[PDB]
Design a protein around this ligand. Structure first.
Ligand SMILES: [Cl-]
Ligand SMILES: [Cl-]
Ligand SMILES: [Cl-]
Ligand SMILES: [Cl-]
Ligand SMILES: [Cl-]
Ligand SMILES: [Cl-]
Ligand SMILES: [Cl-]
Ligand SMILES: [F-]
Ligand SMILES: [Zn+2]
Ligand SMILES: [Zn+2]
Ligand SMILES: [Zn+2]
Ligand SMILES: [Zn+2]
Ligand SMILES: [Zn+2]
Ligand SMILES: [Zn+2]
Ligand SMILES: [Zn+2]
Lengths: 497, 496
């Protein structure tokens, strides 16, 4: 089919602009000289609008139309690809190209601005951009339109189907189960010694471990690389180039470990999406939610599984000797999985983690129903952390400025971490049927069985299935919170109670 | 509105260049080998994207409309359009589909080249060197030429330079160098060069390179230093000119002169009139003029023994065991040693030109179809014997030595000699306004020298042509005499 090839040719063209775009973003987070900032933001905006144009072009629209009528004579991937392109057409089409362009430029600038604001713990430096980033999104919500809550317009950008109504009901149950559970954890003298955790752990050695764990867990270094960054992230330049980045803290080796493993999650996913889909519309994660189910599956359902540490603790002890000298493997894991309310989401424990997502969800729900101004955000932010965690951020760096998501314009994203955590919980239990020897594998430092399970259930499909079908097909039951609640509940009732 | 729409196309090209530059730089500093293929494609798409703007019909329309209206355009705009017209006319002779696959080939070929050099295996790079040469022979056809077919490629870098010109030009060089080296190779004055090949800790070298970069004027808020196989300097945008180097713990010289050399390109790129930023004119006047700046920094500063007066203290403290009880005097005497060798990039001042000539003739033979790919390693090793009296034992130190070809840079090499000549001329003339030059180096005060180079060379960007740059700066067109005298004198006082 000629029209088909002209269609995929265009996507593959977009594919290349994407690599250039992702590299520029990655380069900006790994050393790009500040003097080049302005032109760098300009170029990212140009190549982004290029992609935008190829997707909003009359020709693209004609190719879609034609291919829809001949829908039956086409293969599965082609059908899904055109339906996907059709939505992206109708969707972008609602936005003035001149606006998308300056927005993209603003994001590139806002993020560099943000990186500085956070490093200095300066809200006022970021504030100006935050106001615009939002002002743009409010406007975009108008252009796309919505059915219930205007915030759904943004939620739909990451989890098609997830609405404010659906989330309220679900975050309700999480509160109902986590908060009281976290109170019990707080009301006990079972607090495990964690003194050895906050000691000095030489950076150079943490770097060795992160690289090591990556190799161990299955991250392909021939198709990736590890580098340092203020805020860890994983990006896909092209199917053969999926990079991850982490952050080291000599007073908490944990941050790098779980951050690296977290990112390793996304990477593994990306490094296993069917190669046939490469260069196309469907070579991407099913949704942030399903993507986060992979990062969280690795970080939490492996990295935070005590058997995962049996074989590796020997190394950790040798990397920073004086610190873990005479610390029991048993004490070590108990120290790692210490649950207690803290300020940083990225570094929070498994039990208190969901609350962070909830806090962000609600603040955003407010920002887009015009209930809060940029000026009162820090105050609103701090209040929520008190309501759900009983602690109040004292600095901007550990407060509102903590995450990069807003700086990049990613509003409506955060809830996907919650969902992702739920998906991970559900995938984990169902995986036990096929791999009962799970904990045994971790102790043997054997991860291909687990990885393979995920590749066939999630990875490989890429965007050939939607989240709903991904989970129903893998566990044979739609997304159900009970699993996460049971996992968490059962796990933190034994460590403390 | 025409002039505006015109510069708007140029700025549009400028952002594609950053993207391309970055993709290139990234592929030389870490990019995963599995994204190798698609990386080539993206460079190709983005490169062809720039090509299409320069060859578009609307661009040609804007070109003509501004020419009619010429006399009313500004000096910058005039030159901007003259350049746009040259590239339009030049690129229009090449089939788009072909430039695209050619760009993709260079990207893939350079990747294959890094590996071939690493494994010292020519067979791995041969399949590519075959295609690169083919495309270009074919390009000579499209562009056309007058005297020698190689003239079409030489024109890509040094407009106005031809085989006739270079033959005569190099002829005088061989004549002055060859006998001069015999002498140096024939004297019991061989400076002691034992402490050089000692072990110099890589991590320490890196500190020095960063130190010298700061000293010589490189702006780190506008750039960065990173490692690579083959050092180079690139401009992503006016405020992002990066430089790379290569550390050898068994000869610190490689990283030092390598960095300072790249610093030259950078100090230049970082001083082109900002007004030309985002345009057609914000670049080097030509490869020769660029190599004139890198070579001025590398040789006329780095190799002027006075340069080491203020820094020799640091070199000793970085690797104390190595330079323990070695006189500053003996140091500079060893640094500027002159013995025939295999690697151009590391070759000494006296023998450097011979390396360029060897490549000049080889390339000349290549495009006049007087040699096949299969026979190049042979011919190459022969010339290295013909001019240096030594034969490469591995293709790594032989024909795989430099990257240029893998990158599709044929007709580029001569520009190093022209730059070296330009440097020699700029130098002697600079002595007129700066006699205390050697005094400045002893104090490590370079601002006087940089500012001179900036007013005479950098600031202009592409506003002036090389012929214009040199005439305006020295008062006379280019002249080999300055380089011959400089080398003649300098290396006669060392050994003879
Ligand atoms: Cl990021
Ligand atoms: Cl981002
Ligand atoms: Cl194994
Ligand atoms: Cl290169
Ligand atoms: Cl002296
Ligand atoms: Cl190159
Ligand atoms: Cl002197
Ligand atoms: F890098
Ligand atoms: Zn994540
Ligand atoms: Zn970002
Ligand atoms: Zn295995
Ligand atoms: Zn150079
Ligand atoms: Zn002297
Ligand atoms: Zn290159
Ligand atoms: Zn002197």
């Amino acid at each position: 089919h000629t029209y088909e090839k002209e269609f995929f040719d265009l996507l593959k063209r977009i594919s290349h602009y994407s690599e250039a775009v992702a590299l520029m973003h990655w380069d900006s987070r790994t050393g790009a000289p500040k003097n080049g900032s302005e032109d760098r933001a300009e170029s990212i905006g140009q190549l982004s609008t290029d992609i935008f144009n190829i997707q909003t072009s009359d020709r693209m629209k004609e190719l879609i139309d034609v291919l829809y009528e001949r829908f039956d004579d086409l293969s599965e991937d082609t059908k899904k690809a055109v339906e996907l392109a059709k939505k992206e057409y109708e969707e972008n089409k609602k936005i003035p190209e001149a606006e998308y362009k300056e927005y993209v430029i603003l994001c590139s600038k806002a993020e560099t601005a943000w990186e500085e604001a956070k490093g200095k713990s300066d809200f006022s430096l970021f504030s100006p951009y935050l106001e615009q980033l939002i002002e743009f999104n409010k406007r975009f919500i108008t252009y796309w339109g919505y059915q219930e809550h205007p915030y759904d317009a943004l939620l739909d950008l990451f989890e098609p189907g997830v609405t404010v109504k659906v989330l309220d009901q679900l975050f309700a149950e999480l509160k109902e189960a986590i908060i009281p559970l976290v109170k019990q954890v707080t009301a006990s003298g079972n607090k495990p010694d964690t003194s050895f955790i906050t000691k000095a752990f030489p950076k150079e050695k943490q770097k060795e471990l992160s690289l090591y764990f990556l190799q161990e867990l299955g991250y392909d270094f021939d198709g990736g690389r590890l580098d340092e960054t203020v805020h860890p992230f994983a990006t896909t330049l092209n199917r053969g180039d999926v990079r991850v980045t982490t952050r080291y803290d000599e007073k908490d080796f944990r941050t790098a470990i779980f951050g690296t493993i977290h990112e390793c999650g996304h990477a593994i996913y990306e490094q296993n999406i069917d190669e046939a889909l490469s260069g196309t519309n469907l070579s991407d994660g099913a949704s942030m939610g399903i993507h986060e189910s992979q990062s969280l599956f690795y970080e939490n359902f492996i990295g935070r599984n005590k058997h995962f540490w049996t074989p590796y603790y020997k190394k950790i002890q040798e990397a920073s000797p004086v610190q873990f000298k005479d610390i029991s493997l048993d004490d070590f894991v108990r120290a790692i999985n210490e649950s207690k309310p803290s300020f940083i989401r990225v570094e929070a424990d498994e039990l208190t983690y969901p609350l962070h997502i909830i806090i962000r969800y609600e603040i955003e729900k407010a920002i887009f129903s015009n209930e809060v101004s940029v000026e009162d955000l820090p105050s609103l932010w701090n209040q929520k952390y008190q309501d759900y965690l009983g602690i109040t951020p004292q600095t901007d760096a550990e407060g509102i400025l903590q995450d990069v998501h807003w700086a990049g314009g990613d509003f409506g994203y955060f809830p996907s971490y919650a969902l992702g955590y739920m998906y991970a919980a559900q995938l984990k239990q169902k995986m036990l049927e096929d791999l009962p020897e799970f904990d045994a594998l971790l102790e043997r430092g054997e991860f291909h069985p687990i990885k393979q399970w995920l590749t066939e259930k999630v990875h490989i499909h890429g965007k050939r299935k939607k989240p709903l079908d991904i989970i129903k097909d893998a566990t044979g039951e739609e997304l159900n919170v009970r699993y996460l609640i049971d996992y968490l509940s059962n796990k933190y009732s034994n460590l403390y109670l």
